[PDB]
Amino acid sequence: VMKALILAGGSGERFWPLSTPETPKQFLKLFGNKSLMRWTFERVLEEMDPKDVIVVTHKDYVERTKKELPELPDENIIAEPMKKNTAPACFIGTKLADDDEPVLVLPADHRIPDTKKFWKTVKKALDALEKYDGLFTFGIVPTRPETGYGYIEIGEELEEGVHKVAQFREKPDLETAKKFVESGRFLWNSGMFLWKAREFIEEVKVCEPSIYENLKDVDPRNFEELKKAYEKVPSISVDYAVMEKSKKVRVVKADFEWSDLGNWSSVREIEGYTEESDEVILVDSDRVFVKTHNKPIAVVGLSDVIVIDTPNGILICKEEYAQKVREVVKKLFR
Template identity: 55%
Template sequence: MKAVILAGGSGERFWPYSTLDRPKQFLHLFNNRSLLKNTYDRLRERFSPSDIMIITSERFVDLTREELPELPVENILGEEHGKNTAAACMIGTLAADDDEPVLIVPADHYIGDVDRYWESFERAVKSMRAHDGIYTFGIAPTREETGYGYIEIGDEISPGVNKARSFIEKPELVKARSFAASGKHLWNSGMFLWKRDTFLREMEMWAPSVFIPLKGVDPREPRSVNEAYRSVESISIDNALLERSEMVYVVKGDFSWSDIGSWLSIMEMEGPSNETDSIALPGSSNILVKSRSKRKIAVVGLSDVIVVLSEEGLLVCSSENSQKVKEAVSHFRKYSTGKQRST
């Protein structure tokens, strides 16, 4: 069995900690380990280093080696230009043997109750023996969340495993509220399990624009992969395959989970900040303060605010707008690019 970690994101919503040189998956946001290292260590409970592959950006190969020195060098693929998750999933799956199961996981998610996580995994493996297909892991909603995609579930095929009926992109608040209360919708965790041959057969049928350019590629030869990428459609695995295939199943994950998609996710996990010798919060409530500076920070008379300070910059935003931090990053990059062109 193989495991593939998708580690190519830019993590713009975690500015100013996340930068072009060290994006979110390499940040030590909790427990003094990077998100990538946490994910890798979790997989090491079931997989040997030789059976774990990481797909990342070409720029982050050295960072990945620093984080995971025991991983074989040939198991780290650096994409010259990312082509979204469908291409990354296919490259990772090609590293497996003919009928070998492949587990796909993002590098930057939080999973609590790890024992329950592996119980869900075993449930998927068992179900796959009787019902071959594409398996995804869904999480029961704990709130109305507009930042996640949802999966509508159909008939149950085995305990805790259902046929997938439909996939819904990030919904508006009213729909998210109804999904959370329906009992028929799960959060789309972005974690998958399939057999190599089954996945390739489905990709050939439903996503030829990804399958054809990559079908003969050696996943451990970056040059051939990146050459083939020039002809590959940039599309997510959800759009390319999950929304089209007729053999997609959902495993209900009975464990706490977060995609750690914004600073608000950190506040939900850790709780609001408390006052310290360098943080003052008079008349304020529900405040998150993160700082890599020795400077004192005061937040006075405000509620539901996030403050993050680093050498890269200062972020002040309302909790409800934490998803929009990437818009500020785009502004700075646009201004920086324009300035460079004018000189």
Template identity: 50%
Template sequence: MKTVILAGGSGDRFWLLSTAQVPKQFLKLFAEKTLLRQTFERLSFKVNIDDIYIVTNKIYEQATYSELPEMPKKNILLEPSKKNTAPACTFASLNFPGDETIFIVPADHHIPDTEKFWQTVEKTQKFVENHEGIITFGISPSRPETGYGYIEIEKQIEQDVFSVKMFREKPNYETAVEYINSRKFFWNSGMFMYKNSYFINQMKKHAPQVIVPFLQQTDIESIYQKLPSML
């Protein structure tokens, strides 16, 4: 399994603490280590360092190297501009074989229980080996939060695994209360796992405007000039 840390944050969520020059992944918000460092150590708890990759903006190149000096430099993939999640996942995934399992994680999560985190990851990895699909990780909501996106679930496939009916962006308070009361919604964690060939085929089918520039050119600057910003 290849793990990919998305670390292209722009610094606006935690302004004044974070800025475009020092986005949230470089902040020490919950511990004596930055969020990026915590994410890296959470993954390297089970994954070989050679199998951990980072997608970040080129302006954060030196900061990333300084924060994670043990990372192979070839595993830090630099975007020339910020185009959001779909282009970043596509950029990373095209570096891997089709039969590889890919685990995408944001750089800014605070997850104190690493053992429990990996229990969920390993269960998901087994599911991906036997099922086609892009798996998204939901978090059981503890309050009617208006600052998060939500995942609306449909039928249960197996224990703790559901089909997704729809992704819902940040709701107002009244709608968030309805989500919580229905028991059919989870917070969207922004973590994904998939078999690489399936993801690439789905991008060709549903988002050719994202993947085609990567397939037609090799110059990353030219590619990113053509890409839409897409979640």
């Protein structure tokens, strides 16, 4: 008896020109001709009955979610009145479980190719959840001082493979993040969580009452009642709202390869640089990532660059600047 809560992700802005302007990243078909969301759903269905899966998402994306995920019952798509970030989404989705029921909370727009190792780790977390309670995170070994992740300080070994969390720090500044990675005492928050419904609801009561007092009585399926509640409700992530403040966080180490697919460089990391061919010509150019559309692309005198050609536009991006495609979209659709 478990529920799985799939959270709509944010914008596909950093994947321009593949991405149409406001389209959520979770709909991108970056691999195997299926959306990030679809692969996520299929990973969940490996062990779960679709009736036990909830997608909490903005109302605009409901119809396309139905289409991506025909196996999901319609009643299991909770349409949000507006974008309030993950804490209110978590709350309303979690409220649909029984008090004593675990809820696996998953972003829609990550990539985890080994679905068996994924479930291996989730089963270890479920067993640990039974023994220790608390809010469970899944930690990845950090390879860089990334400033858009949360950092989980590994605390006392509850048992082999499962630790308390000395502290949770969401999106530290660069110099803080450097020191974390350099200490060896931290893992990256993979952005997925596990908790028993009741226990998370009470942590929100304590941690962020503004959400709890307004949603506690709300029927998530009744849009009108949700819309009124959500206006009184603050926009904030679960990480800041709850994780950074809770006294009972636990971490398990991820048994699996993972990515949040932050930008075009994330994609290159997975597929590799592009080789020369009849469509990709490289003269004095190393470490290029090129996606051709309908014609040859030649790159001369430049290394460490991303070139993406689609009917919507062409991006030519110095690798280390891949985050700034956000700014391209700001200028293009203002």
